[PDB]
Amino acid sequence: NKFNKEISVAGREIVTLPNLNDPQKKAFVYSLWDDPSQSANLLAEAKKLNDAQAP
Amino acid sequence: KEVQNAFYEILHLPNLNEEQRNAFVQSLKDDPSQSANLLAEAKKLNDAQAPK
């Protein structure tokens, strides 16, 4: 339950990061499902990528 | 990649609250064979909870 909640919360944040493109979001989310123990690292990577793609 | 795609689409649905989204993800994990039914249920709930 803990991991499913973690990936649900992290996944929701990832898909709502406004500067990511759809393939980037989908790739992070697929990685989340494949290895939920990486949720914090994937969220952090996604946020950094999002910030580098700011207008 | 059917289960992964359903997970992705569930996470994208804007009008689910956190408890509802978490519950769908848990159900997907518990029985991935039901991905299409769960996604359809989630979509229905999403549309019913559109801001009015």
Author numbering:
A (entry chain B): 3 to 57
B (entry chain A): 7 to 58
Source paper text:
We adopted the Z domain of staphylococcal protein A and its affibody binder dimer complex as a model system. We next generated libraries at the interface of a weakly associating dimer (Z+ ZSPA-1) with micromolar affinity to determine if we could affinity-mature the interface by coevolution. To clarify these inter-residue co-variations discovered from the sequence data, we determined crystal structures of 10 coevolved pairs that spanned a range of cross-reactivities and orthogonalities (5 from LL1 and 5 from LL2).
Each Z-A mutant binds to its binding partner with nanomolar affinity (3.98 to 44.2 nM) but has minimal cross-reactivity with other monomers. The backbone structures of the three mutants are relatively similar (Cα r.m.s.d. of Z-A after aligning Z-B ranges from 0.447 Å to 0.641 Å). The dimer interactions of LL2.c17 have sharply diverged from the other two LL2 mutants, with the Phe13A-centered hydrophobic patch surrounded by multiple rewired hydrogen bonds, an additional hydrogen bond between Asn11A and Phe32BTyr, and α-helix 2 of Z-A was slightly shifted to generate new interactions with helix 1 of Z-B, which explains the significantly improved affinity between these two proteins compared to the original pair. Binding of VFLV/IVVY and LVLF/FIIV are highly enthalpically favored and entropically disfavored, but by the end of the trajectory we see a more moderate enthalpy of binding coupled with a moderately disfavored entropy in IVFF/FILV. For example, A-LILFK has more Z-B binding partners (B=77) than A-LIFFK (B=15) from the LL1 library, and A-LVLF (B=53) and A-VFLV (B=42) are also more cross-reactive than A-IVFF (B=3) from LL2 library sequence data.
